Amino acid sequence: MRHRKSGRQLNRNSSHRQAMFRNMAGSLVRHEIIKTTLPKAKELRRVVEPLITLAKTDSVANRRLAFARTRDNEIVAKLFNELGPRFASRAGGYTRILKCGFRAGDNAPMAYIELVDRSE
Amino acid sequence: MIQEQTMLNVADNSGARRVMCIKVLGGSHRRYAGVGDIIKITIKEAIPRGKVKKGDVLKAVVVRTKKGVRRPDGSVIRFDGNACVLLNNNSEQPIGTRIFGPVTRELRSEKFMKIISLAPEV
Amino acid sequence: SNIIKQLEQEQMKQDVPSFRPGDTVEVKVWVVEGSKKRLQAFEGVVIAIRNRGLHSAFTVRKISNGEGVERVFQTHSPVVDSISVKRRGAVRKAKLYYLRERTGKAARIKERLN
Amino acid sequence: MIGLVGKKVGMTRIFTEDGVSIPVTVIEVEANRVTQVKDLANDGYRAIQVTTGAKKANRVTKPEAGHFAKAGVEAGRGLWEFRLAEGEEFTVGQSISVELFADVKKVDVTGTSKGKGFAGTVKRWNFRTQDATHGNSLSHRVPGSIGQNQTPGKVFKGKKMAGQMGNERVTVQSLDVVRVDAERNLLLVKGAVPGATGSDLIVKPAVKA
Amino acid sequence: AVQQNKPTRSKRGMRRSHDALTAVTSLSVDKTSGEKHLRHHITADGYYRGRKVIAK
RNA sequence: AGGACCGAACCGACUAAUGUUGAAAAAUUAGCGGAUGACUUGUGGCUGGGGGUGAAAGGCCAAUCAAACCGGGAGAUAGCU
RNA sequence: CACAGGUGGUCAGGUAGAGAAUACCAAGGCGCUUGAGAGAACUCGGGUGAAGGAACUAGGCAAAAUGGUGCCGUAACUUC
RNA sequence: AAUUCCUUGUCGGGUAAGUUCCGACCUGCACGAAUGGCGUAAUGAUGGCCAGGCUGUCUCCACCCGAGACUCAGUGAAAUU
RNA sequence: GAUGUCGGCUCAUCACAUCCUGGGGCUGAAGUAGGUCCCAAGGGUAUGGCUGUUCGCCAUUUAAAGUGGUACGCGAGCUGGGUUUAGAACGUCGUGAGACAGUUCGGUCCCUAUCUGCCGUGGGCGCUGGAGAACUGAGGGGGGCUGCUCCUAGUACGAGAGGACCGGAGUGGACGCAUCACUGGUGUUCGGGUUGUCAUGCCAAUGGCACUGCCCGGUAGCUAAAUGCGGAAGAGAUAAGUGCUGAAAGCAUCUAAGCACGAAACUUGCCCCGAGAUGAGUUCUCCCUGACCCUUUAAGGGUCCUGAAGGAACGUUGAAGACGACGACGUUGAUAGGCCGGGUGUGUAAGCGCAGCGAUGCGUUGAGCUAACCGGUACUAAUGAACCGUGAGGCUUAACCUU
Ligand SMILES: [Mg+2]
Ligand SMILES: [Mg+2]
Ligand SMILES: [Mg+2]
Ligand SMILES: [Mg+2]
Ligand SMILES: [Mg+2]
Ligand SMILES: [Mg+2]
Ligand SMILES: [Mg+2]
Ligand SMILES: [Mg+2]
Ligand SMILES: [Mg+2]
Ligand SMILES: [Mg+2]
Ligand SMILES: [Mg+2]
Ligand SMILES: [Mg+2]
Ligand SMILES: [Mg+2]
Ligand SMILES: [Mg+2]
Ligand SMILES: [Mg+2]
Ligand SMILES: [Mg+2]
Ligand SMILES: [Mg+2]
Ligand SMILES: [Mg+2]
Ligand SMILES: [Mg+2]
Ligand SMILES: [Mg+2]
Ligand SMILES: [Mg+2]
Ligand SMILES: [Mg+2]
Ligand SMILES: [Mg+2]
Ligand SMILES: [Mg+2]
Ligand SMILES: [Mg+2]
Ligand SMILES: [Mg+2]
Ligand SMILES: [Mg+2]
Ligand SMILES: [Mg+2]
Ligand SMILES: [Mg+2]
Ligand SMILES: [Mg+2]
Ligand SMILES: [Mg+2]
Ligand SMILES: [Mg+2]
Ligand SMILES: [Mg+2]
Ligand SMILES: [Mg+2]
Ligand SMILES: [Mg+2]
Ligand SMILES: [Mg+2]
Ligand SMILES: [Mg+2]
Ligand SMILES: [Mg+2]
Ligand SMILES: [Mg+2]
Ligand SMILES: [Mg+2]
Ligand SMILES: [Mg+2]
Ligand SMILES: [Mg+2]
Ligand SMILES: [Mg+2]
Ligand SMILES: [Mg+2]
Ligand SMILES: [Mg+2]
Ligand SMILES: [Mg+2]
Ligand SMILES: [Mg+2]
Q: Please report the DSSP string for chain B in residue order.
A: -B-TT-EEEE-BSSSEEEEEEEEE-SSTT---B-TT-EEEEEEEEE-SSSSS-TT-EEEEEEEE-SS-EE-TTS-EEEESS-EEEEE-TTT-SBS-S-B-S---GGG-SSTTHHHHTTSS--
- 3-state SS, residue C75: coil
Q: Indicate which technique resolved this structure.
A: cryo-EM
Phi–psi pair at A70, nearest 5 degrees: -120, -35
d(CA B40, CA B59): 4
D-chain residues within 8 Å CB-CB of B74? 13, 21
- 3-state SS, residue D22: strand
d(CA B92, CA B113): 12
d(CA D108, CA D194): 11
- DSSP state for residue A78 in the 8-state scheme: I
CB–CB of C87/C19 below 8 Å? no
B-chain residues within 8 Å CB-CB of C64? 101-102, 120-121
Helix (H) or strand (E) holding C9: helix C2-9
CA dihedral B88, B91, B93, B97 (to 10 degrees): -60
Extended strands (E) in A1-120: 33-37, 95-102, 109-115
Extended strands (E) in A39-106: 95-102
What is the CB neighbour count within 10 angstroms for residue E49? 13
CB–CB of D194/D110 below 8 Å? yes
> Based on C-alpha coordinates, what's the Rg of chain D?
23
Which residues lie closer than 8 Å to C10 by C-beta, 6 or more apart? none
Nearest of D126, D149, D111, D151 to residue D25 by alpha carbon: D111
Q: How far is the CA of A14 from the centre of ligand 44 (A)?
A: 16
CB–CB of D164/D119 below 8 Å? yes
d(CA D193, CA A110): 44
CB–CB of B95/B52 below 8 Å? yes
Nearest of C103, C114, C94 to residue C46 by alpha carbon: C94
Measured over the CA atoms of residue A76, residue A81, residue A87 and residue A88, the dihedral's sign is positive
Spacing of C58 CA from I181 C1' in Å: 17
E-chain residues within 8 Å CB-CB of A100? 41-42
CB–CB of D202/D109 below 8 Å? yes
- DSSP state for residue C54 in the 8-state scheme: G
Query: Nucleotides of chain I within 7 Å of a protein C-beta?
Result: 9-13, 45-48, 59-65, 69-80, 109-123, 131-137, 141-142, 147, 172-184, 188-189, 200-201, 205-210, 212-213, 216-223, 225-233, 269-273, 282-287, 309-322, 328-333, 337-340, 343-351, 362-363, 366, 368-377, 379-387
What is the CB neighbour count within 10 angstroms for residue A47? 18
Angle at which helix A38-54 crosses helix A60-70, to 10 degrees, equals 160
What is the CB neighbour count within 10 angstroms for residue C88? 15
Q: How far is CA D188 from CA B19, D17, D33, D185, in A?
A: 47, 18, 21, 10
CB–CB of A25/A83 below 8 Å? no
- 3-state SS, residue C43: strand
- Burial of residue D98 (number of CB atoms within 10 Å: 0-12, 13-18, 19+): buried
List the Cα angle B68/B72/B74 in 5-degree steps. 65
d(CA C23, CA C27): 12
CB–CB of A65/A54 below 8 Å? yes
CB–CB of B45/B54 below 8 Å? yes
What is the CB neighbour count within 10 angstroms for residue D44? 8
- Contacts of A102-105 with C-beta under 8 Å, sequence gap 24+, read A103/A37
Count of structural domains, chain B:
1
C-chain residues within 8 Å CB-CB of D13? 54-55
Parent domain of B9: 1-122
d(CA A17, CA B2): 45
Bridge partners, residue C25, by sequence: C44, C85
Angle at which helix A14-31 crosses helix A38-54, to 10 degrees, equals 70
Å resolution of this model?
2.2
Spacing of D209 CA from I242 C1' in Å: 35
Nearest of A81, A84, A86, A80 to residue A119 by alpha carbon: A86
d(CA C18, CA C15): 9
Q: Please name the nucleotide lying closest to B6, CA to C1'.
A: G52
- CATH number for the domain including B103? 2.40.150.20
Say if the Cβ atoms of B76 and C71 lie within 8 Å: yes
| Nearest protein residue to the C1' atom of G35, measured from CA | A106
Q: How far is the CA of A52 from the centre of ligand 46 (A)?
A: 25
List the Cα angle C70/C16/C97 in 5-degree steps. 25
Q: How far is the CA of A16 from the centre of ligand 44 (A)?
A: 13
List the Cα angle A31/A33/A34 in 5-degree steps. 95
- Burial of residue C107 (number of CB atoms within 10 Å: 0-12, 13-18, 19+): middle
Q: How far is CA C114 from CA B64, C90, C94, C110, in A?
A: 39, 9, 17, 12
How far does B78 lie from chain D, in Å, by closest CA?
A: 19
| Gaps in chain C after residue (C–N beyond 2.5 Å) | none
Phi–psi pair at B35, nearest 5 degrees: -65, 130
Extended strands (E) in C1-114: 24-33, 36-50, 57-64, 67-74, 80-82, 85-87
Measured over the CA atoms of residue A73, residue A79, residue A80 and residue A82, the dihedral's sign is positive
Q: Please name the nucleotide lying closest to A19, CA to C1'.
A: I208
- Homologous superfamily of the A13-115 domain (CATH): Ribosomal protein L17 (3.90.1030.10)
Query: Nucleotides of chain H within 7 Å of a protein C-beta?
Result: 15-17, 56-68, 72-73, 79-81
d(CA D166, CA D119): 9
Helix (H) or strand (E) holding A65: helix A60-70
DSSP result, D92-134:
TT-EE-GGGGSS--EEEEEEEPPP-EEE-HHHHH-PPP--SST
A-chain residues within 8 Å CB-CB of D114? 3
CA dihedral D190, D196, D198, D204 (to 10 degrees): -50
DSSP result, D32-57:
EEEEEEE-TTTTSS-EEEEE-S---T
**Strand H atom within 7 Å of E4 CB:** yes
- Burial of residue D50 (number of CB atoms within 10 Å: 0-12, 13-18, 19+): buried
Bridge partners, residue C82, by sequence: C28
Cβ < 7 Å from strand F, D residues 123-182:
133, 135-138
Nearest of D4, D27, D22 to residue D198 by alpha carbon: D27
d(CA D179, CA D194): 19
CB–CB of B103/B64 below 8 Å? yes
- 3-state SS, residue A111: strand
Taking the Cβ of residue D124 and every Cβ of chain A, the question of whether any pair is shorter than 8 Å is answered with: no
Residues of C with CB under 8 A from a CB of D: 1, 3-4, 6-8, 11, 30, 32, 54-55, 74, 76-79
Q: Which residue of D has its CA nearest to B71?
A: D20
d(CA A25, CA D179): 53
Nearest of A118, A46, A120 to residue A83 by alpha carbon: A118
Chain-centre distance of CA A70, in angstroms?
Answer: 10
- Burial of residue C55 (number of CB atoms within 10 Å: 0-12, 13-18, 19+): middle
Chain-centre distance of CA D99, in angstroms?
Answer: 20
Q: How far is CA D66 from CA D57, D76, D128, in A?
A: 12, 13, 54
CB–CB of B62/B39 below 8 Å? yes
Q: Which residue of D has its CA nearest to A1?
A: D116
Q: How far is CA C21 from CA A36, C77, C87, C96, D5, in A?
A: 48, 20, 11, 7, 45
Q: Please name the nucleotide lying closest to D136, CA to C1'.
A: I78
B-chain residues within 8 Å CB-CB of C54? none
Say if the Cβ atoms of C72 and B64 lie within 8 Å: no
Parent domain of D25: 1-209
d(CA B15, CA D71): 82
d(CA D87, CA D84): 7
**One-letter amino acid identity for A39?**
P
Nearest of B72, B70, B76, B73 to residue C77 by alpha carbon: B73
Extended strands (E) in A43-108: 95-102
**Domain segments of chain A as ranges:** 13-115
Query: Nucleotides of chain G within 7 Å of a protein C-beta?
Result: 34-44, 50-59, 61-62
CB–CB of C60/C73 below 8 Å? yes
User: In what order do the strands lie in the sheet containing D32-38?
Assistant: D80-83, D47-51, D32-38, D95-96
Question: Half-sphere exposure of residue D156, counting CA atoms within 13 Å on the CB side?
Answer: 10
Nearest of B18, B45, B19, B24 to residue B36 by alpha carbon: B24
| Pick from C64, C68, C73: CB nearest B75 | C73
Say if the Cβ atoms of B102 and C71 lie within 8 Å: no
- DSSP state for residue E22 in the 8-state scheme: P
**One-letter amino acid identity for D189?**
V
**One-letter amino acid identity for A70?**
T
From its phi and psi, is residue C76 left (phi > 0), alpha (psi between -120 and 50) or beta? alpha
CB–CB of B104/B77 below 8 Å? yes
Nearest of B52, B43, B63 to residue B14 by alpha carbon: B52
Count of structural domains, chain D:
1
Nearest of D26, D55, D12 to residue D185 by alpha carbon: D26
